[PDB]
Model the fold of this input.
Amino acid sequence: RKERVARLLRMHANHREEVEELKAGDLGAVVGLKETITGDTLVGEDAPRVILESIEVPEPVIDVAIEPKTKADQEKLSQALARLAEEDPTFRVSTHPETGQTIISGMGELHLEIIVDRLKREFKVDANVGKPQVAYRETITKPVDVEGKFIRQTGGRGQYGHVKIKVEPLPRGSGFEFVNAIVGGVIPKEYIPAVQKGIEEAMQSGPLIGFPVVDIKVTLYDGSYHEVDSSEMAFKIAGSMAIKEAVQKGDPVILEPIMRVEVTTPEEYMGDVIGDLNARRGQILGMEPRGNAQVIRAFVPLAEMFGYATDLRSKTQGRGSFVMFFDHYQEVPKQVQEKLIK
Amino acid sequence: RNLSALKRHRQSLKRRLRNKAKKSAIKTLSKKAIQLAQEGKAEEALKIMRKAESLIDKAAKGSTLHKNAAARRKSRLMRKVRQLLEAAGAPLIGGG
Amino acid sequence: GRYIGPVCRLCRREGVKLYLKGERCYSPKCAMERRPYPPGQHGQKRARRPSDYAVRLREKQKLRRIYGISERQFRNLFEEASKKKGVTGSVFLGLLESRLDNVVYRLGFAVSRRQARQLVRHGHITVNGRRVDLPSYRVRPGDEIAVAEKSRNLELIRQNLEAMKGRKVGPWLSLDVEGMKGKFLRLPDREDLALPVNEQLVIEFYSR
RNA sequence: UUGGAGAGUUUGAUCCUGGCUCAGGGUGAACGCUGGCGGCGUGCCUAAGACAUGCAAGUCGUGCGGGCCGCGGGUCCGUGGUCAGCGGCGGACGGGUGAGUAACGCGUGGGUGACCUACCCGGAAGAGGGGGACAACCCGGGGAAACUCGGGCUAAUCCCCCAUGUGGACCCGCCCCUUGGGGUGUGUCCAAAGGGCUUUGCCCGCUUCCGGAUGGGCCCGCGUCCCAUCAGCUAGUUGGUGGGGUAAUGGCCCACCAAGGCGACGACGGGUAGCCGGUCUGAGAGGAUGGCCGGCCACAGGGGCACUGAGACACGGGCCCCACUCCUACGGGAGGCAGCAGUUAGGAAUCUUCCGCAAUGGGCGCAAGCCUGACGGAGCGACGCCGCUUGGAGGAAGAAGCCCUUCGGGGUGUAAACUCCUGAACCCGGGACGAAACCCCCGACGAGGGGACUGACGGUACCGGGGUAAUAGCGCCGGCCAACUCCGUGCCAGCAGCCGCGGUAAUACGGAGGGCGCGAGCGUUACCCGGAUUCACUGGGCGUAAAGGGCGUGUAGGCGGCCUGGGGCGUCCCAUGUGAAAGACCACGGCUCAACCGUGGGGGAGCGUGGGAUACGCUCAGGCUAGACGG
RNA sequence: CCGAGGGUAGGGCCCGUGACUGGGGCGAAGUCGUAACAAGGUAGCUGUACCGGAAGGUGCGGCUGGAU
Ligand code: SF4
Ligand SMILES: [Mg+2]
Ligand SMILES: [Mg+2]
Ligand SMILES: [Mg+2]
Ligand SMILES: [Mg+2]
Ligand SMILES: [Mg+2]
Ligand SMILES: [Mg+2]
Ligand SMILES: [Mg+2]
Ligand SMILES: [Mg+2]
Ligand SMILES: [Mg+2]
Ligand SMILES: [Mg+2]
Ligand SMILES: [Mg+2]
Ligand SMILES: [Mg+2]
Ligand SMILES: [Mg+2]
Ligand SMILES: [Mg+2]
Ligand SMILES: [Mg+2]
Ligand SMILES: [Mg+2]
Ligand SMILES: [Mg+2]
Ligand SMILES: [Mg+2]
Ligand SMILES: [Mg+2]
Ligand SMILES: [Mg+2]
Ligand SMILES: [Mg+2]
Ligand SMILES: [Mg+2]
Ligand SMILES: [Mg+2]
Ligand SMILES: [Mg+2]
Ligand SMILES: [Mg+2]
Ligand SMILES: [Mg+2]
Ligand SMILES: [Mg+2]
Ligand SMILES: [Mg+2]
Ligand SMILES: [Mg+2]
Ligand SMILES: [Mg+2]
Ligand SMILES: [Mg+2]
Ligand SMILES: [Mg+2]
Ligand SMILES: [Mg+2]
Ligand SMILES: [Mg+2]
Ligand SMILES: [Mg+2]
Ligand SMILES: [Mg+2]
Ligand SMILES: [Mg+2]
Ligand SMILES: [Mg+2]
Ligand SMILES: [Mg+2]
Ligand SMILES: [Mg+2]
Ligand SMILES: [Mg+2]
Ligand SMILES: [Mg+2]
Ligand SMILES: [Mg+2]
Ligand SMILES: [Mg+2]
Ligand SMILES: [Mg+2]
Ligand SMILES: [Mg+2]
Ligand SMILES: [Mg+2]
Ligand SMILES: [Mg+2]
Ligand SMILES: [Mg+2]
Ligand SMILES: [Mg+2]
Ligand SMILES: [Mg+2]
Ligand SMILES: [Mg+2]
Ligand SMILES: [Mg+2]
Ligand SMILES: [Mg+2]
Ligand SMILES: [Mg+2]
Ligand SMILES: [Mg+2]
Ligand SMILES: [Mg+2]
Ligand SMILES: [Mg+2]
Ligand SMILES: [Mg+2]
Ligand SMILES: [Mg+2]
Ligand SMILES: [Mg+2]
Ligand SMILES: [Mg+2]
Ligand SMILES: [Mg+2]
Ligand SMILES: [Mg+2]
Ligand SMILES: [Mg+2]
Ligand SMILES: [Mg+2]
Ligand SMILES: [Mg+2]
Ligand SMILES: [Mg+2]
Ligand SMILES: [Mg+2]
Ligand SMILES: [Mg+2]
Ligand SMILES: [Mg+2]
Ligand SMILES: [Mg+2]
Ligand SMILES: [Mg+2]
Ligand SMILES: [Mg+2]
Ligand SMILES: [Mg+2]
Ligand SMILES: [Mg+2]
Ligand SMILES: [Mg+2]
Ligand SMILES: [Mg+2]
Ligand SMILES: [Mg+2]
Ligand SMILES: [Mg+2]
Ligand SMILES: [Mg+2]
Ligand SMILES: [Mg+2]
Ligand SMILES: [Mg+2]
Ligand SMILES: [Mg+2]
Ligand SMILES: [Mg+2]
Ligand SMILES: [Mg+2]
Ligand SMILES: [Mg+2]
Ligand SMILES: [Mg+2]
Ligand SMILES: [Mg+2]
Ligand SMILES: [Mg+2]
Ligand SMILES: [Mg+2]
Ligand SMILES: [Mg+2]
Ligand SMILES: [Mg+2]
Ligand SMILES: [Mg+2]
Ligand SMILES: [Mg+2]
Ligand SMILES: [Mg+2]
Ligand SMILES: [Mg+2]
Ligand SMILES: [Mg+2]
Ligand SMILES: [Mg+2]
Ligand SMILES: [Mg+2]
Ligand SMILES: [Mg+2]
Ligand SMILES: [Mg+2]
Ligand SMILES: [Mg+2]
Ligand SMILES: [Mg+2]
Ligand SMILES: [Mg+2]
Ligand SMILES: [Mg+2]
Ligand SMILES: [Mg+2]
Ligand SMILES: [Mg+2]
Ligand SMILES: [Mg+2]
Ligand SMILES: [Mg+2]
Ligand SMILES: [Mg+2]
Ligand SMILES: [Mg+2]
Ligand SMILES: [Mg+2]
Ligand SMILES: [Mg+2]
Ligand SMILES: [Mg+2]
Ligand SMILES: [Mg+2]
Ligand SMILES: [Mg+2]
Ligand SMILES: [Mg+2]
Ligand SMILES: [Mg+2]
Ligand SMILES: [Mg+2]
Ligand SMILES: [Mg+2]
Ligand SMILES: [Mg+2]
Ligand SMILES: [Mg+2]
Ligand SMILES: [Mg+2]
Ligand SMILES: [Mg+2]
Ligand SMILES: [Mg+2]
Ligand SMILES: [Mg+2]
Ligand SMILES: [Mg+2]
Ligand SMILES: [Mg+2]
Ligand SMILES: [Mg+2]
Ligand SMILES: [Mg+2]
Ligand SMILES: [Mg+2]
Ligand SMILES: [Mg+2]
Ligand SMILES: [Mg+2]
Ligand SMILES: [Mg+2]
Ligand SMILES: [Mg+2]
Ligand SMILES: [Mg+2]
Ligand SMILES: [Mg+2]
Ligand SMILES: [Mg+2]
Ligand SMILES: [Mg+2]
Ligand SMILES: [Mg+2]
Ligand SMILES: [Mg+2]
Ligand SMILES: [Mg+2]
Ligand SMILES: [Mg+2]
Ligand SMILES: [Mg+2]
Ligand SMILES: [Mg+2]
Ligand SMILES: [Mg+2]
Ligand SMILES: [Mg+2]
Ligand SMILES: [Mg+2]
Ligand SMILES: [Mg+2]
Ligand SMILES: [Mg+2]
Ligand SMILES: [Mg+2]
Ligand SMILES: [Mg+2]
Ligand SMILES: [Mg+2]
Ligand SMILES: [Mg+2]
Ligand SMILES: [Mg+2]
Ligand SMILES: [Mg+2]
Ligand SMILES: [Mg+2]
Ligand SMILES: [Mg+2]
Done:
């Protein structure tokens, strides 16, 4: 819908200011917008009608793999969740590079119970899944810098890709930053969209446990070429032989996703819920009353959050509850660190 | 927050005062001349009566009275004084 | 706007030959010459008896699609002659024939009315000097349709004036080849034209 | 004689009554899907809810005197600005809303011998002497502010007195008329103002008086919605008299006397509602309707009120009260968007805090000019209507793909691809009309020529040149009703306006292929009319379908036999006045067409006045016996 | 003097609402019996009065829209 931008206002410590124009990058108050709420996308009248999605992070933290069983009805699976991709854009569906299989991401057990239920009872889907949801991520500690030489010049059929990148640690939750820092043009202009596809394909699997790597920063800066031999299918594997090895060399260390719970247990069963919440790797944050009753709120890693579904029944005689939402990332102790690698 | 309407209101007050003046003396003299017209006191009631008639037309010159208003007040006064002086005559002096 | 759709389906649905592709119609490559049954999955089926409304319905559209005119303007022209004197089931066809784009088609200036419209709309036709790009224009008797000077040098009006070296016009029309100009004589009679349309049924329908 | 269409459904079937429902056309619309352009329209119907800020009525130095300033010097005058103040004129028009009102409020035709009218217009006359005050100004108290108060000086087109009376007004006569109309005689009373320029001259003013013109007031006959489950209502109430008041009649107001006034022809009471031009439907009759535009009325936050005035009992003037809101320095004080935009709430929904005084019109003025949210344009919204574009031509016995299929074939389909052709948009140049008046010059500031200036829209329309194939969506496809198959479903999911569909071969559900209908729109909901001859005047009925009152008597009320005449009320005819404009009707013309817009023609009804006719109805009189009563 | 309004007192109409209640409508594979349509197995309908779990029965008078 359109709306009338009328007064353009700014606010001062002592008074108000009406101005004539607002430049890009800046912010302010505009009067006249009748039916506009926050988080809304405003463009000019005859301008690209685009959403600024921007407000980022869906973000999937549970990995549930699905198997199309046997066999010819695999193309209905990829077409079933396709009806849910434009209908529910929070979870993802991406195949595993190593091990090779589709993993249906999601937000929670109930999120990935209704997708499993509805498909089995509205779309038939010849399938049956596992499935845990431990969906770990891996990243580095110190900056790395390697090379990926993918050269085969002993015959007369292409293959020459020389790609040198700098993988440096980016804070957790920041994501993936790719920049082109070629001095002059030691690599052709066309083989930049395709070297990135070897950097991101190798990042779909890990060196330690085989799970995707995030929170890094690849800086392509130099690399040689051969005019006739170099192919676009020669620089891609050059950007994968330097990503499977940079992150593998420079101090690769583990991380996991923690969740926040709010338990509404009667006060008579508090100490039972508390003591166990900590033996569930818990860091308490405080308690408050509610239905009288009382609510308790802490930080518990997802891995120790499976039995807790029915455990609140074992304790509270069936009088408690919870909610559980993801929060952030950290570094598991070396007791579980050095033992998860198996 | 301005406008000469207050200027206009200022004048109307001055006219209201000057107008409320003449009408009082009109009544004061018209009523007195009719009293002495019941007395008779014949001459002594025309003397006042003339002064009244003047004030009737002096106001009518401006906005204090319309002409019909003057014509009306002049008609009644001459009438109601006459029938009074019909109790005992003597029309002296001039006036009618 | 206008129809801009496929047009040989029309002659099939009507059961008549509504000459509208122009040159293509006379040749035996015409749809009607080949397929007379109406289009669609059940064209060849032996038709079922139409109701009287179906009869009058299939007449009203037959007239419209001959001239190519929207329902609005079609009805307003209809409702005009009715509000006028005389027989409505006549002057209607007159006001249909008094349209500038229809006059351009009968004066040979075009292969088809579909084509004549564009030529009118593209400013290539001036009437009595005034350049008139209005197809909805209504023409009166006493007028001289012509091609513009800056539009006399075109490799398409030529081949249509050259086709009209041989063919003759109707009674109520004048033409001047080489000099590429026309002349509107008078308003026609129901005998002057003989369109495959029983005009009574068109008035017989709108009364409902 | 320019105008008139019906369908489905009660049964096994028939005929009828009769209800139900649909097709049509309409909107200040809105909601769904879709949505390119131009034009002319139009856009808070809900909360007459409350509102931030801005703007919406002001002008004259050719009415007066001051504060300051520039300008020519002898701080004197002159002068130009400028600021308020005094004094004129306007603010009573112009703009908005639809609250209230069932009423002379409106509409229509009159009546005023019961009345008024500023500026404008015409005729007649006149402008001579005197006297006085309040602001500005200085001085002074108080306040945050709003700002007020006190003392003194002073100008005029401000106020006062005397003179003049062509005239006018009033008392009583007296004359013609007939409601208080027109004269005249005597007594009585009243006019005023000056400024300016070129100067024994004009110009704008001023004064009393008669006339026109325009604008009203007041009053009257007729017309004007639902409820009788509202049947009786009324003390200023109805009438007189006297007076008050008003421009003027009047119970309008007041004292008094009288006992009256209204009601089934609907008083009183209740509900709703602004009324007309018109608008829409309709074969007509009738129904519904009152946005926009023109005319009238009413209100200006809710109320009461007077003042000024030519005119208001005053939207942006004043006084008081009440509800609400806000400012504050808490001592106090301010405000009224149903003006133009705008905010907020409510809601299904209704817009730019734009430009211009260039035109038109209004106010002030000698003029220049100044003011003008009236007005002219611009903006927004497919809200409405109207025009236009998304291309034209060639192009297979018919590509691919999808669908159907007796697997022979059929269908989409000349459609596309494809060849030819044109050129929406965009780009470049030119560039409007609306604008010639006021005014300067001649003449005579007259008449008549001649002269310059000014364009918001807008560098828009439109004209020249170049110039690219350039948006298509929606509803239906059982019968009404136009348009058919396939699959999925299995009295499920769902459709449905009516009858009715779905229980494993669904033309009815959802999808697809196919088809019908409309097109920048299409469908839906809400409401008005139509079909409804189903409130029936046109134009229905009542034995059994809904409907004869249980049956008499009789009030008002409706209706009334035969012959002749008087009147002319109904009725009929003519003539005239009226029926504004706009619209509609017909004709033509202006914007490239149209919509839109202009010029001109043509009427009606109904009412006023005058004339006539006399059958029929009425009425006054006379007469008959066929009705009716009676012996 | 009149006067907006304020207040005291007493009335009339309308709307919303109320424990509880009185019937009425739409439903449907019920419980109950089986009144009307055939003389419906007691001819039916009817105004009334009384009684009865319920439809209904009965008394009086009426109607034929009652059969042989
Ligand atoms: S080509 Fe033939 S069938 Fe097709 S529209 Fe022309 S006349 Fe009709
Ligand atoms: Mg504890
Ligand atoms: Mg004020
Ligand atoms: Mg004030
Ligand atoms: Mg003034
Ligand atoms: Mg006294
Ligand atoms: Mg006498
Ligand atoms: Mg064909
Ligand atoms: Mg006709
Ligand atoms: Mg017709
Ligand atoms: Mg050219
Ligand atoms: Mg050209
Ligand atoms: Mg019709
Ligand atoms: Mg005729
Ligand atoms: Mg029937
Ligand atoms: Mg029946
Ligand atoms: Mg049946
Ligand atoms: Mg039947
Ligand atoms: Mg309809
Ligand atoms: Mg819409
Ligand atoms: Mg859309
Ligand atoms: Mg517009
Ligand atoms: Mg409002
Ligand atoms: Mg205004
Ligand atoms: Mg200086
Ligand atoms: Mg000097
Ligand atoms: Mg000085
Ligand atoms: Mg001044
Ligand atoms: Mg005003
Ligand atoms: Mg007005
Ligand atoms: Mg208006
Ligand atoms: Mg209006
Ligand atoms: Mg209303
Ligand atoms: Mg009433
Ligand atoms: Mg009444
Ligand atoms: Mg009247
Ligand atoms: Mg009346
Ligand atoms: Mg009159
Ligand atoms: Mg009068
Ligand atoms: Mg005039
Ligand atoms: Mg003298
Ligand atoms: Mg003198
Ligand atoms: Mg003097
Ligand atoms: Mg102070
Ligand atoms: Mg002070
Ligand atoms: Mg004051
Ligand atoms: Mg003096
Ligand atoms: Mg007389
Ligand atoms: Mg005198
Ligand atoms: Mg005078
Ligand atoms: Mg004097
Ligand atoms: Mg001189
Ligand atoms: Mg006179
Ligand atoms: Mg009632
Ligand atoms: Mg009383
Ligand atoms: Mg009295
Ligand atoms: Mg009296
Ligand atoms: Mg009264
Ligand atoms: Mg008495
Ligand atoms: Mg009466
Ligand atoms: Mg109302
Ligand atoms: Mg009818
Ligand atoms: Mg009405
Ligand atoms: Mg109106
Ligand atoms: Mg309005
Ligand atoms: Mg108006
Ligand atoms: Mg008023
Ligand atoms: Mg208000
Ligand atoms: Mg008020
Ligand atoms: Mg008021
Ligand atoms: Mg007021
Ligand atoms: Mg206001
Ligand atoms: Mg005012
Ligand atoms: Mg405050
Ligand atoms: Mg303030
Ligand atoms: Mg104080
Ligand atoms: Mg103070
Ligand atoms: Mg006080
Ligand atoms: Mg005060
Ligand atoms: Mg307020
Ligand atoms: Mg506005
Ligand atoms: Mg407004
Ligand atoms: Mg709003
Ligand atoms: Mg709301
Ligand atoms: Mg709403
Ligand atoms: Mg709302
Ligand atoms: Mg608004
Ligand atoms: Mg102007
Ligand atoms: Mg003007
Ligand atoms: Mg305007
Ligand atoms: Mg538009
Ligand atoms: Mg259109
Ligand atoms: Mg074939
Ligand atoms: Mg075969
Ligand atoms: Mg075949
Ligand atoms: Mg083609
Ligand atoms: Mg191809
Ligand atoms: Mg072109
Ligand atoms: Mg001027
Ligand atoms: Mg002038
Ligand atoms: Mg002149
Ligand atoms: Mg311009
Ligand atoms: Mg424009
Ligand atoms: Mg040129
Ligand atoms: Mg070209
Ligand atoms: Mg195209
Ligand atoms: Mg093409
Ligand atoms: Mg194409
Ligand atoms: Mg385009
Ligand atoms: Mg349809
Ligand atoms: Mg059908
Ligand atoms: Mg059919
Ligand atoms: Mg078939
Ligand atoms: Mg299916
Ligand atoms: Mg459907
Ligand atoms: Mg049935
Ligand atoms: Mg089926
Ligand atoms: Mg159907
Ligand atoms: Mg279907
Ligand atoms: Mg209806
Ligand atoms: Mg019909
Ligand atoms: Mg009809
Ligand atoms: Mg009817
Ligand atoms: Mg009927
Ligand atoms: Mg009848
Ligand atoms: Mg009937
Ligand atoms: Mg009956
Ligand atoms: Mg009775
Ligand atoms: Mg009798
Ligand atoms: Mg009688
Ligand atoms: Mg008789
Ligand atoms: Mg009689
Ligand atoms: Mg006679
Ligand atoms: Mg008569
Ligand atoms: Mg007449
Ligand atoms: Mg006449
Ligand atoms: Mg007219
Ligand atoms: Mg006209
Ligand atoms: Mg005519
Ligand atoms: Mg033109
Ligand atoms: Mg006329
Ligand atoms: Mg005529
Ligand atoms: Mg006629
Ligand atoms: Mg006679
Ligand atoms: Mg006679
Ligand atoms: Mg007799
Ligand atoms: Mg007898
Ligand atoms: Mg009172
Ligand atoms: Mg009070
Ligand atoms: Mg009271
Ligand atoms: Mg009380
Ligand atoms: Mg009470
Ligand atoms: Mg209850
Ligand atoms: Mg039941
Ligand atoms: Mg029985
Ligand atoms: Mg039985
Ligand atoms: Mg029995
Ligand atoms: Mg009984
Ligand atoms: Mg018994
Ligand atoms: Mg029988």
